[PDB]
Amino acid sequence: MQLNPESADLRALAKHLYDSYIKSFPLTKAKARAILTGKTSPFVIYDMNSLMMGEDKIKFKEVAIRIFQGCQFRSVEAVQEITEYAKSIPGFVNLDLNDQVTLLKYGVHEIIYTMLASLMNKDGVLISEGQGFMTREFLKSLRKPFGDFMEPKFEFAVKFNALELDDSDLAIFIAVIILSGDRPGLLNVKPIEDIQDNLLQALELQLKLNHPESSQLFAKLLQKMTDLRQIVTEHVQLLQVIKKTETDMSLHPLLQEIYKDLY
Numbered sequence: 196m197q198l199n200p201e202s203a204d205l206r207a208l209a210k211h212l213y214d215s216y217i218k219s220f221p222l223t224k225a226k227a228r229a230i231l232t233g234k235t236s237p238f239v240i241y242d243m244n245s246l247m248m249g250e251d252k253i254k255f256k257e258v259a260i261r262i263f264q265g266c267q268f269r270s271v272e273a274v275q276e277i278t279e280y281a282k283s284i285p286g287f288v289n290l291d292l293n294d295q296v297t298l299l300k301y302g303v304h305e306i307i308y309t310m311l312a313s314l315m316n317k318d319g320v321l322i323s324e325g326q327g328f329m330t331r332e333f334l335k336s337l338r339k340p341f342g343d344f345m346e347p348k349f350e351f352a353v354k355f356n357a358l359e360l361d362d363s364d365l366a367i368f369i370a371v372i373i374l375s376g377d378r379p380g381l382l383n384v385k386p387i388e389d390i391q392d393n394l395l396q397a398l399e400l401q402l403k404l405n406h407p408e409s410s411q412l413f414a415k416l417l418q419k420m421t422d423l424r425q426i427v428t429e430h431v432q433l434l435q436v437i438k439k440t441e442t443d444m445s446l447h448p449l450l451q452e453i454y455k456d457l458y
């Protein structure tokens with residue numbers, strides 16, 4: 196490894212993505228872990244009683260449905276943030292507009308679960324920008340099939356968080372996921388692939404500098420890119436079950452359009 200014009204540009208790219216990341220996302224991993232460890236306080240929701248008291252304290256029908264709808268609305272909101280961030284990725288807006296919409300379409304959920312890991316520990320998940328904390332066991336206490344909803348996410352998060360990536364690692368990682376040339380229905384694959392190769396170089400450089408304690412981190416991360424897709428995959432199958440069983444759930448129409456091409 197050498198300090199040359201190429202690597203200097205890669206460092207500039209990483210710094211740029213990090214700045215955009217900080218501006219695009221309200222709650223960083225750095226601020227999130229501090230809260231999760233008290234170094235800073237959220238209303239903890241751990242049972243039905245604290246759930247009701249909490250809906251009345253934190254500034255945000257049947258309980259399971261309310262919660263599930265809360266996740267949908269948070270999700271739609273996140274799509275907005277992810278989109279704003281994607282536009283700051285060098286080259287992204289110069290792509291054919293349809294490919295931009297396609298990339299985001301097949302990428303937002305992978306990123307959503309990536310970033311949700313930052314807000315999780317083994318006990319639960321931060322909600323409403325850190326105003327609240329909903330416990331893992333409370334989510335499992337929700338009636339079938341909603342009690343199985345979040346558990347794959349927690350399991351992924353616990354493994355992912357062991358990698359101990361920080362926000363400047365995640366800033367590049369999320370860009371790499373977005374610029375996947377293998378999404379269905381892309382018009383111009385090569386320019387997309389060119390940008391990702393560049394992002395992947397920046398990412399490898401970043402991990403080497405930022406994590407001197409591990410030479411396996413880059414390969415472990417590329418492996419996680421696949422776990423993510425499986426989680427989306429597994430999540431849509433569970434969505435069909437919710438449909439072919441319970442008619443009292445109205446799925447947000449924006450998400451509907453995304454899930455159309457995910458079946």
Ligand SMILES: CN(CCOc1ccc(C[C@@H]2SC(=O)NC2=O)cc1)c1ccccn1
Nearest residue numbers: 262265266267269270320321322323329450
């Ligand atoms: C558990 N939390 C935190 C958010 O946790 C999430 C879990 C899953 C998603 C994916 C959504 S849900 C769906 O089916 N399709 C999507 O895009 C998005 C967020 C909340 C948040 C608000 C109210 C109640 N609880």
